[PDB]
Design a protein around this ligand. Structure first.
Ligand SMILES: c1ccc2c(c1)[nH]c1ccccc12
Ligand SMILES: c1ccc2c(c1)[nH]c1ccccc12
Ligand code: FES
Ligand code: FES
Ligand code: FES
Ligand code: FES
Ligand code: FES
Ligand code: FES
Ligand SMILES: [Fe+2]
Ligand SMILES: [Fe+2]
Ligand SMILES: [Fe+2]
Lengths: 388, 105, 389, 389, 107, 104
């Protein structure tokens, strides 16, 4: 919806919508925080897809209101005034809104105003799952959450733990760093490799049957839309890096087999199976905050039949997984994303990039995202839709 | 039940006429060619008087921000307006134009 | 003239010039500092309406020159060189100008240059009144200062004391907040209300017609242009704020009645009378520095017949009025202005705002400002007016 | 090409190319560092004409590769991985290039990739002379270095010493500040004037015959293009600065005669002779880093017949010339350049500037540069040249 | 393997493109410009796109990925971001049958 | 008083001729069609010679910054010029161009 120079969109015929989606895709669910981070009666602020939002927990349930008064456009959060359990009053002229439907129900500075009951502040559906807070940044009643989650993330036995932080790069650079088969070269010295005795090649090169290695999913019963890069089953593990024929670097010859398959799913969540251990899975989102930043929402899943196991896992997570994996392994992904910022900052990197064979899967993802996204977020969605 | 606005003759096609109703909010009567229509005078997006706006066909444009409404349906035609306008029934009985005291159902 | 997207200006038919006046209105007087801040032969810098200026006091009188050499456009103030009492010499190539008329009278590096006496650095009228320094940021002969000041500010017995500072918000946001009848809600917890026992409602339920909500003054004996907030004339003060019929807040039931009289005047100065006490007045300017900042020039006036009263007032001011009112009360206005920056920063708030009844006061000001300002300052005035035949 | 608003370019018909060359002139040699600053296998990063570059020394020879992987456009320098002596491996997906020709020779993550041997990273000629590292930021076979150097810089006995740093101003403001006969007014209080007993006027004003003071050089056999401002033999030294006919400042009446002649040469290097001592010469480059910054590459040359003399000169350079001249004299040139940024930042200064007689030399330079430069560096050169069939 | 049988000159309408897959080698693209036939590698030199899936504009082929283009006769770049020349393969018609060389022209 | 400049025919239509004066600032004589005009030669905005500028109708455009003046009135026609040019009445008699001795 016109976020990029038209001359550039006209050039990338295979995935113009993706290139145009600098602010992300509207009408999809996005994780923005963990349940434990939002307590009863304590409104929290955050920006999602360029929009400032306010989340509050009332009687255990979460509600989301756009953090922008309808009157003069100030953020209510500058000075929070929740005067009754079910409402929030703007600190400026006291326009009061209901958390449940955003309706302007009262105005303390003028209880006779004709605006009362005749204006509505934007609300967004909020759903908690696996201790994660999901917000449907879209219009109309929301589709089921599973549609925008990777397979198995919502399994009843799947115990989810993770971390979240703000990273300075467009969400797409994050996505394409994560779903990249050959980028693991940057993880060759991660402490997880040695310390967890992993079998990790320098890179997973494309095998012989391309159409077999890449699997586009658009037949998922739940409506999931994504792409698989079957590196372990069809790709080739490159363990000896050479230059001029001479071996200059070797991959890791550990015993733990991981990363059998990787998959990217709209609106932008990667699934690595199995990882960081043969009995675990990694699910990570690259949530658009604005055009220059995203939330790097990391989660690790591991089946647990009982609390004793949930606690054991909970301890291994805090003592090993989080420190050694989520950080020790993925930290290099952070500055890697940051490193691509300049090339794509002016939108021209989308034309000048010189791709090679292992990028085949990324190309499949760009097309899938272009064809199946539920809407292009525009700056006008942020300021106020415009039309004559 | 009805109020006397003016004679169809007093209004040229494409003109607006504000109807002040003591004790209640003002209304706006628009002549779109040969048919007369009436809605709330106050723009639903603020406190502007639509009768002071510009009429183009069956669409009225608010003087404050350029928002617009279809004077027949009351539905928003141009941003920033989003809240439909209150439409009132009109009738021309014997050259004179009348407007219902309350907005249609 | 043309500082905003033309599509937006076309939408705000009720006040396009105002919305366009990002940088303020040219051809008006503006207070920028206090007389005591500039001493003899000690030039001071400042930016007004986006223009860098230099002010100096020579033989007790103030002079103002644009702080930008005609030659290569550097600010003279980077390294001031006042080599004779009546001139200032650019530190770069020594072009020398007279403070009196800005004429290029000498060039030390080329005494026989044909440019000497053939160029002139922009000068602006400067006038001191009530211990305040006003600069006429405009062209041609200036009008009386009284035209651009609120009624009574210049009264002979009016003792003026104040404070000035730079605030991060466009000047218009400051003006509208100051004249906003319902913004009183943000002052509900002010120390001044309690410590000075002020009566202060949470807002007003409008009464009467639209025309009765304000009183526009299109001409004063001196040509003043402004608007009075008359919401309290037929309006009902709100002392009990309710939500769903339940009382959640109450106004202040003090016995001191203030702000019976509130008026905003071009180029952008508010008069609140009486305030912060029944026997004094507040006059405050929101002076445009650039598109994102303004001077919040606060002054408190109190009639004083002698030197003793002026002394007492000054003591009251420094000990109570300045800290309890100017800071204790108006500080909330400062962050309120800052809170509106984002919504209007892309100029789109001027279209998307959803106004309610008390905003009639603001609308009257936007129209008055649009109809009677003396010129729109443009980025071109800053760099150099442009025109191609 | 199209770095500036066309309306402005059409206005400066006399030197549009120059005004358009905000990023500098492509296809010229530029000094970027001194040889001793780059050692064997020590990859160094730098930005020249807006392009990020990597320079390395292999077996003593310098090589220059664009610091941007062909794949996803990351800078190879974020994490340098020179796996073998003759190559550099991108830290991202391991694409590997040869320093010698920039050819993508290997890809550790995909040894069979068809891209191998079919892509080439941009390389630029690099050359060392007089202890200085010159990069030819251009395409095709480079011309002799001599073409882009001032006369005598490359003489056999000319011993060159210097200092380099990044200055926050466009390169042209640096060029014009340096090749400006009247700006020496800013150096009237430099410690070099007194401490080195220099004879220095407040400014050299135009002589009697203009076409005689300025000499446009375009017939030099080595191909160098520049302009001389013959201040010493054709200009007029102004020693008594006056305001209203009264003397307010005098120049310096030292015995050491310097600055007989000054000349600016493409791509942008000034030669002041003799300076800062009667037996020395100063050669300084204003190298374009990006539109807002430049390298102020200072060099002082003094004939030396042997090592004893070279070492003697070096000691003097470190103990006197560097702190007293390069810093003591030219430090004022730095903030002088910075002072002109705002005026020209919007490109408006190129239209609004009010020049006087001594700027005639600068005007001649603007014309020569516009006519003899070898190419206008554009933003497209930085992101990737564009063109539709 | 010298000449590869592609198809009948009849199987191709003017302004069309046909991909020729080869065992153990990279694919070729045969273009018909009017009544003449030309051929180049099928893979865009700027990446991994298939030029046969692009748009033919006279004697210029436009890559579907980034809009780059080449002259199908000379193989030279016609539009940015392409900079590396395409390998060109000779084509000849024997008895109404289109044949494409198994080796590209040298230079 | 008047200064004999040149023969009318020495100037082609739409051209400009610089007239130097010892001890005085040079002048510019413009031939607009078959009419002649005169002003100071130095652009009032700098050191440029208007005689090296572009003549468009009765408006002379400075070669330096594109500023311009009406050669008849001397008033600025285009920015950045703001100081009016000095004008000199001109008279053509017997095919000879004469320009006033002093501005008027
Ligand atoms: C290949 C192999 C492993 C990974 C990958 C691509 N992308 C990842 C993102 C997070 C964690 C692991 C991986
Ligand atoms: C006139 C006289 C001396 C100098 C000059 C202009 N420009 C200079 C730049 C560097 C060092 C000396 C000079
Ligand atoms: S801005 Fe919120 S009530 Fe006025
Ligand atoms: S008040 Fe009518 S569009 Fe805003
Ligand atoms: S910039 Fe002031 S005299 Fe040159
Ligand atoms: S960005 Fe350098 S090899 Fe991928
Ligand atoms: S892959 Fe063909 S232009 Fe980029
Ligand atoms: S010198 Fe003539 S317009 Fe500037
Ligand atoms: Fe990674
Ligand atoms: Fe206030
Ligand atoms: Fe200097």
């Amino acid at each position: 919806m016109a976020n990029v120079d038209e001359a550039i969109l006209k050039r990338v015929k295979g995935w113009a919508p993706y290139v145009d989606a600098k602010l992300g895709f509207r009408n999809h669910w996005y994780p923005v925080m963990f349940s434990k981070e939002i307590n009863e009666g304590e409104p929290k602020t955050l920006k999602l897809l360029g929009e400032n939002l306010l989340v509050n927990r009332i009687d255990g349930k979460l509600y989301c209101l756009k953090d922008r008064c309808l009157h003069r456009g100030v953020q209510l959060s500058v000075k929070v005034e929740c005067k009754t359990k079910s409402t929030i009053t703007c600190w400026y002229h006291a326009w009061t809104y209901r958390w449940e439907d955003g309706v302007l129900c009262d105005i303390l500075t003028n209880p006779t105003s004709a605006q009362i009951g005749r204006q509505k502040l934007k609300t967004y559906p909020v759903q908690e799952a696996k201790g994660c807070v999901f917000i449907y940044l879209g219009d109309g009643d929301p589709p089921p959450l599973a549609r925008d989650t990777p397979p198995n993330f919502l399994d009843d036995d799947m115990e989810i733990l993770g971390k979240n932080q703000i990273i300075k790069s467009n969400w797409r650079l994050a996505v394409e760093n994560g779903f990249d088969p050959s980028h693991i070269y940057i993880h060759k010295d991660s402490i997880l490799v040695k310390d967890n005795d992993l079998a990790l090649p320098l890179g997973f090169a494309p095998g012989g049957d391309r159409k077999q290695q890449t699997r586009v999913v658009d037949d998922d019963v739940v409506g999931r839309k994504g792409v698989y890069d079957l590196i372990g089953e069809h790709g080739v593990p490159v363990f000896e890096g050479t230059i001029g024929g001479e071996v200059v670097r070797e991959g890791a010859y550990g015993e733990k087999i991981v990363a059998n398959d990787i998959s990217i799913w709209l609106p932008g969540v990667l699934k690595v199976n199995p990882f960081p251990n043969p009995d675990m899975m990694q699910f990570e989102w690259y949530v658009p905050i604005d055009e220059n930043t995203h939330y790097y929402f990391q989660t690790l899943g591991k089946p647990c039949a009982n609390d004793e196991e949930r606690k054991k896992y909970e301890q291994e997570f805090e003592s090993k997984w989080k420190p050694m994996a989520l950080e020790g392994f993925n930290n290099d992904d952070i500055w890697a994303r940051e490193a691509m910022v300049d090339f794509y900052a002016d939108d021209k990197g989308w034309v000048n990039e010189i791709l090679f064979e292992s990028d085949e899967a990324i190309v499949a993802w760009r097309k899938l995202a272009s064809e199946h996204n539920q809407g292009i977020q525009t700056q006008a969605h942020v300021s106020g839709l415009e039309h004559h | 039940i009805w109020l006397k606005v003016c004679a169809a003759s007093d209004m040229q096609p494409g003109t607006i006429r504000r109807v002040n109703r003591v004790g209640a909010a003002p209304l706006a009567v628009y002549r779109v060619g040969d048919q007369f229509y009436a809605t709330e005078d106050t723009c639903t997006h603020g406190i502007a008087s639509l009768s002071e706006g510009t009429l183009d066909g069956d669409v009225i444009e608010c003087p404050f921000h350029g928002g617009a409404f279809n004077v027949c349906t009351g539905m928003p035609a141009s941003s920033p307006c989003t809240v439909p306008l209150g439409v009132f029934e009109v009738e021309v009985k014997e050259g004179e134009v009348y407007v219902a005291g309350e907005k249609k159902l």
